[PDB]
Ligand binder design. Structure first.
Ligand SMILES: Nc1ncnc2c1ncn2[C@@H]1O[C@H](CSCC[C@H](N)C(=O)O)[C@@H](O)[C@H]1O
Length: 261
């Protein structure tokens, strides 16, 4: 019954064309042309990002929504866009990335952007059953979209449930994907986590309109209900006023090489 659930219901009423127009209405995307060509050519020393994730984390990072410091852990790293971004930051001392990388799940990608050498990738790992490790910055970008709001809610509560075990070890910084912040139970878990660890949820402008995903971050504190609804209002507005107008932005190019001495 929340505004976001109404949004989800109306999203499912869109035919294929409607959905297509909607998905790219007033959105911002990075141009992946060059990165895709370089990766396809096997170039590992041009500093291109392995995925759209690098730009998403940079957005949070550059405006203080999440500080990237010391020991970084990246749950559900996939190709590794967040790991490579974090590894290139001077304040970061190490990066441990974990992901399934099996049964259709993408495996970490090997490139040599700055600090690749301080990253330890580990695949064939289900982070829901991985024993928490002490760290300073906790990152988690997991949440598989579903036509079912019930399912998005279940997957979202499971992620927050798992992440709470890691935050309970004591972490200074965090950035965690929240697939369905519009679901009632998720909203309440977020409110409880906020009273326990602080932070709030922020909508990344690089996220597509087809998902209501927002990120639980340590760099800001605000009323969760209000801001989740603001995003709901924006998404509903774009569905009612489709245009498919997209704004392209330069993708992230990181420096290259190992961090040594
Ligand atoms: N239970 C689990 N354990 C480990 N990894 C998981 C998982 N569930 C989902 N994942 C992985 O979480 C990843 C989310 S996509 C992450 C993109 C990454 N931030 C980047 O910048 O490239 C997917 O690769 C998915 O396979």
């Amino acid at each position: 019954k929340t505004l976001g659930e109404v949004w989800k219901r109306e999203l499912n009423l869109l035919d294929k064309r409607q959905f297509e127009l909607y998905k790219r209405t007033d959105i911002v995307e990075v141009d992946r042309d060059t990165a895709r060509r370089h990766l396809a050519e096997g170039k590992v020393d041009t500093g291109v990002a392995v995925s759209r994730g690098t730009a998403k984390l940079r957005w949070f990072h550059e405006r203080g929504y999440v500080k990237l410091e010391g020991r970084v852990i990246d749950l559900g790293c996939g190709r590794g866009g967040w790991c490579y971004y974090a590894a290139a930051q001077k304040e970061v001392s190490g990066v441990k990335g974990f992901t399934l990388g099996r049964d259709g799940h993408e495996k970490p990608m090997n490139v040599q952007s700055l600090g690749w050498n301080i990253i330890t990738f580990k695949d064939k790992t289900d982070i829901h059953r991985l024993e928490p490790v002490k760290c300073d910055t906790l990152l988690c970008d997991i949440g598989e979209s579903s036509s079912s709001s019930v399912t998005e809610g279940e997957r979202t509560v499971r992620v927050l449930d798992t992440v709470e075990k890691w935050l309970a070890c004591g972490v200074d910084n965090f950035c965690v994907k929240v697939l369905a912040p519009y679901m009632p139970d998720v909203l309440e878990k977020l409110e409880l986590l906020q009273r326990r660890f602080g932070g709030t949820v922020i909508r990344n402008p690089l996220s597509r309109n087809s998902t209501h995903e927002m990120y639980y971050v340590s760099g800001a504190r605000s009323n969760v209900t209000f801001t989740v609804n603001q995003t709901s209002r924006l998404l509903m507005r774009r569905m009612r006023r489709p245009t498919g107008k997209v704004t392209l932005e330069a993708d992230v190019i990181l420096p290259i090489g190992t961090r040594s001495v």
